[PDB]
Design an enzyme around this catalytic site. Structure first.
Site, PDB file in Angstrom:
ATOM      1  N   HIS A  41       0.090  10.708   7.704  1.00  0.00           N
ATOM      2  CA  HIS A  41      -1.336  10.300   7.742  1.00  0.00           C
ATOM      3  C   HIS A  41      -1.568   9.259   8.855  1.00  0.00           C
ATOM      4  O   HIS A  41      -2.682   8.735   8.971  1.00  0.00           O
ATOM      5  CB  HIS A  41      -1.805   9.911   6.335  1.00  0.00           C
ATOM      6  CG  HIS A  41      -1.390   8.563   5.860  1.00  0.00           C
ATOM      7  ND1 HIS A  41      -0.608   8.405   4.741  1.00  0.00           N
ATOM      8  CD2 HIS A  41      -1.672   7.319   6.316  1.00  0.00           C
ATOM      9  CE1 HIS A  41      -0.403   7.119   4.541  1.00  0.00           C
ATOM     10  NE2 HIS A  41      -1.047   6.428   5.497  1.00  0.00           N
ATOM     11  N   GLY A 143      -1.274  -1.776   5.921  1.00  0.00           N
ATOM     12  CA  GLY A 143      -0.286  -1.778   7.021  1.00  0.00           C
ATOM     13  C   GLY A 143       1.142  -1.609   6.528  1.00  0.00           C
ATOM     14  O   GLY A 143       2.048  -1.478   7.386  1.00  0.00           O
ATOM     15  N   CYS A 145       2.340   0.873   4.899  1.00  0.00           N
ATOM     16  CA  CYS A 145       2.611   2.323   4.762  1.00  0.00           C
ATOM     17  C   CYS A 145       3.875   2.645   5.562  1.00  0.00           C
ATOM     18  O   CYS A 145       4.095   2.010   6.614  1.00  0.00           O
ATOM     19  CB  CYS A 145       1.396   3.088   5.252  1.00  0.00           C
ATOM     20  SG  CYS A 145       0.041   3.073   4.151  1.00  0.00           S
TER      21      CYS A 145
HETATM   22  C1  LIG Z   1      -0.826   1.506   4.457  1.00  0.00           C
HETATM   23  C2  LIG Z   1      -1.897   1.157   3.430  1.00  0.00           C
HETATM   24  C3  LIG Z   1      -1.407   0.990   2.001  1.00  0.00           C
HETATM   25  O1  LIG Z   1      -0.341   1.338   1.566  1.00  0.00           O
HETATM   26  O2  LIG Z   1      -2.273   0.391   1.154  1.00  0.00           O
HETATM   27  C4  LIG Z   1      -3.709   0.480   1.371  1.00  0.00           C
HETATM   28  C5  LIG Z   1      -4.293  -0.681   0.564  1.00  0.00           C
HETATM   29  C6  LIG Z   1      -3.577  -0.972  -0.737  1.00  0.00           C
HETATM   30  C7  LIG Z   1      -4.275   1.851   0.993  1.00  0.00           C
HETATM   31  O3  LIG Z   1      -5.297   1.932   0.313  1.00  0.00           O
HETATM   32  N1  LIG Z   1      -3.640   2.927   1.431  1.00  0.00           N
HETATM   33  C8  LIG Z   1      -4.312   4.188   1.691  1.00  0.00           C
HETATM   34  C9  LIG Z   1      -3.819   4.847   2.969  1.00  0.00           C
HETATM   35  C10 LIG Z   1      -4.137   6.309   3.026  1.00  0.00           C
HETATM   36  C11 LIG Z   1      -4.064   7.215   2.008  1.00  0.00           C
HETATM   37  N2  LIG Z   1      -4.443   8.456   2.441  1.00  0.00           N
HETATM   38  C12 LIG Z   1      -4.774   8.379   3.766  1.00  0.00           C
HETATM   39  C13 LIG Z   1      -5.216   9.372   4.640  1.00  0.00           C
HETATM   40  C14 LIG Z   1      -5.479   8.992   5.938  1.00  0.00           C
HETATM   41  C15 LIG Z   1      -5.306   7.672   6.372  1.00  0.00           C
HETATM   42  C16 LIG Z   1      -4.867   6.690   5.509  1.00  0.00           C
HETATM   43  C17 LIG Z   1      -4.595   7.037   4.178  1.00  0.00           C
END
Ligand SMILES: C=CC(=O)O[C@H](CC)C(=O)NCCc1c[nH]c2ccccc12
Lengths: 304, 305
Positions: A41, A143, A145
């Site tokens: 993603h 960030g 991820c």
């Molecule tokens: C790296 C972020 C993380 O771990 O935590 C945040 C906040 C807790 C989050 O909400 N993550 C969602 C990232 C995501 C999910 N599906 C997606 C599809 C495209 C682009 C992004 C996403």
């Protein structure tokens, strides 16, 4: 003496953490030999979040729209595949600090250490369990991820989890390092349901043995129970079923304390009936399910 | 989101861990530049440990009765001084993996990561705090002596604790890296016990702020108080006094949630009297005092090393 939620030394993994950027999106990658693994993603824009076509999004990218960064050094991308839900960037330089490693898919109940990172930079390390509903209760801000979960066993690092996303509940979802999601989740910002969570029965039994070994018998009693009759009481408390396999696994810890598993199941039955009435077991006012039999055997001495 | 007892990345410290053997006695040592620091009780046998004269016990040893071992490689000892309760072995080889570091003495209530080691081999890492009674609740089995505690600040490792010994009540005692003991303990096989421990009031307040930030608000109330009124309730529950300084320190977390410190002190006041009425805060039945204000701020910002 003492019992403490203890993570593995994060050193061998810190040496594999890198920063992956795709347009404005930036998250963490794992750099092993000449390959960088990261959540796919990374190639999504804010519009693509809801219903992304990854194959169509990815056939539009060349190697030079992927900036891999190992600390100060920039790494040159020379190839990009996708496996399930992970992107696999091939780089010109094999990671000199690559540890001895395998990839394993862990089951619910099993524990790993997490090395939380921001911009390929490690911030903290903590111990987690794959919950029965396939989520993990982690500490992860924006960030984080592509942060990885791992066990280390004799200089061999077993990568088991890559962080993909947080759910509305506040719990966390991810894939194994072959990019297959743990639980019925997909890398989409569609509403997906965190299944109803249970307490990991076998891990609580192990942690009661751990308390007996550290010199606490106060919670025991003179009752036994058939495996079945326990499970009928257990499941009334949102406790996971206990299987014949869970029992065989606890055999070593039963033998070292001479408290048969089903006697310990009775002690738990009563603990569930009563609570603690102002006592604590291994420093905790409720029953800890994030310590495995293996975990207990390592951390706790042979001396009872 | 989420909140976890989170330790610093142990890699910079893992590079400094070595095995020190003196006859049959073996424990862990810290290898920085050309020096190896370890508990001085390595020079004692089980007999000597009853009432050891360390200066006399050490004048009996040459460099060749010290086997320093960095993994497989043997390190050659070419000098040995003492400093308070740490032995300082000089070695022929400067540690190539020596990080940027200082030695620092932490206060009670402040937290550090520990890297547990057995035979100069790291096994695990966890967070703990210097308790007010100068003990620490660690997990240590035999051979874990010379395991170190540390904070990381940017690139800089601050070594604050070296494990010396376990106490009767299964808690742990040690020195700073200059060999000065934390608390009223001596490196000796004698009758020593932990004083009466207090709960670290300011750290509980920080951890309640951490719960408000992660959605748990059920303990909040419209009521406020004054420092003095609260401290009378604190002192009643074996909680440390809260000072004007503790309040200023909690300023950032109060501002970010718009719950003034004394509002939060009222929530706690009531929590101490009337129970938690079944409910939990950040998945804990008890009130957790092993997270500092700094610790809370860092984890709920996400700053890296
Ligand atoms: C790296 C972020 C993380 O771990 O935590 C945040 C906040 C807790 C989050 O909400 N993550 C969602 C990232 C995501 C999910 N599906 C997606 C599809 C495209 C682009 C992004 C996403």
């Amino acid at each position: 003496s003492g019992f403490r939620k203890m993570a593995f030394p994060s050193g061998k993994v810190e040496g594999c953490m890198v920063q992956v950027t795709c347009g404005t999106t930036t998250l963490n990658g794992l750099w092993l030999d000449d390959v960088v693994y990261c959540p796919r993603h990374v190639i999504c824009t804010s519009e693509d979040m809801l219903n992304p076509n990854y194959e169509d999004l990815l056939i539009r990218k060349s190697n030079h729209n992927f900036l891999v960064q190992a600390g100060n050094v920039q790494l040159r991308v020379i190839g990009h595949s996708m496996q399930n839900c992970v992107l696999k960037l091939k780089v010109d330089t094999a990671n000199p600090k690559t540890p001895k490693y395998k990839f394993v898919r862990i089951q619910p109940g099993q524990t790993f250490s997490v090395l939380a990172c921001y911009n390929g930079s490690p911030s903290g390390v903590y111990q987690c369990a794959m919950r029965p509903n396939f989520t993990i209760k982690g500490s992860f801000l924006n960030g984080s991820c592509g942060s990885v979960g791992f066990n280390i066993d004799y200089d061999c690092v077993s990568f088991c989890y890559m962080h993909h996303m947080e759910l509305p509940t506040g719990v966390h979802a991810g894939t194994d390092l072959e990019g297959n999601f743990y639980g019925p989740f997909v890398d989409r910002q569609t509403a997906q349901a965190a299944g109803t969570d249970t307490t990991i029965t076998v891990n609580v039994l192990a942690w009661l043995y751990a308390a007996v070994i550290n010199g606490d018998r106060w919670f025991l009693n003179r009752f036994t129970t058939t495996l079945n009759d326990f499970n009928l009481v257990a499941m009334k408390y949102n406790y996971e079923p206990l299987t014949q396999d869970h029992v065989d696994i606890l055999g070593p810890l039963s033998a070292q304390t001479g408290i048969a598993v089903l006697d310990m199941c009775a002690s738990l039955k009563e603990l569930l009936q009563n609570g603690m009435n102002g006592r604590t077991i291994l420093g905790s006012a409720l029953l800890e399910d994030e310590f495995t039999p293996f975990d207990v055997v390592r951390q706790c001495s042979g001396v009872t």
